[PDB]
């Protein structure tokens, strides 16, 4: 499917057996989710954003189904204002960013 | 031009007679550029992101050329770590997310 940007590009995701809404975010290198129950060990890490930084829990090799497409990768969990799906997962479901043309 | 996401989706922009690099950002409602010299009046405003909020200058009806495509809209200027092109301008250049 193709998605226009007149509205936030939100998708439904299924992770850790739970269903959530998340933003397809081409501006994020990483995937960051609001605090939630994940299973396993994790490592501490710091990530920055427009207002500064936040500390998050880093989980590796997490399976996530993004709008019906499966992907496995790193998922960060922390005080982000919104669930964001970053490039580390966007590449796995083949998202491309197209625009304009002429040629 | 189709763009894959294995690397950051950076583009060259021209605004206020100056050339800059900026990130195409589907996760941003607004366009936010690092402190730069723009002409005209503005309004103080605050916006948030991961990490909290920052205060910015809100410039209206700014002409920007993004990768060779013209658009006019609101441009915020402030302490952002990277120049970001948000949806307010992405729609104007027919930007689509496909997968």
């Amino acid at each position: 499917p193709q998605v226009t940007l007149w509205q936030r590009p939100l998708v439904t995701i299924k992770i850790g057996g739970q269903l959530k809404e998340a933003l397809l975010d081409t501006g994020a290198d990483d995937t960051v989710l609001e605090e939630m129950s994940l299973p396993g060990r994790w490592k501490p890490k710091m990530i920055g954003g427009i207002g500064g930084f936040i500390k998050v829990r880093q989980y590796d090799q997490i399976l996530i189904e993004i709008c019906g497409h499966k992907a496995i990768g790193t998922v960060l969990v922390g005080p982000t204002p919104v669930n964001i799906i970053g490039r580390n997962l966007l590449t796995q479901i083949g998202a491309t960013l197209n625009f304009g043309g002429s040629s | 031009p189709q763009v894959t996401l294995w690397q950051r989706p950076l583009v060259t922009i021209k605004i206020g007679g100056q050339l800059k690099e900026a990130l195409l950002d589907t996760g941003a409602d607004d366009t936010v550029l690092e402190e730069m010299s723009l002409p005209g009046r503005w309004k103080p405003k605050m916006i948030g992101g991961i990490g909290g909020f920052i205060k910015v200058r809100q410039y209206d009806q700014i002409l920007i050329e993004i990768c060779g495509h013209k658009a006019i809209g609101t441009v915020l200027v402030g302490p952002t770590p990277v120049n970001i092109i948000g949806r307010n301008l992405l729609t104007q250049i027919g930007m689509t997310l496909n997968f």
């Binding site: 933003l23 975010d25 920055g48 954003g49 | 990130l23 950002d25 916006i47 948030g48 992101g49």
Partner: peptide, 6 residues
């Protein structure tokens, strides 16, 4: 709300 991350 303006969301890139690094």
């Amino acid at each position: 709300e303006t969301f890139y991350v690094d």
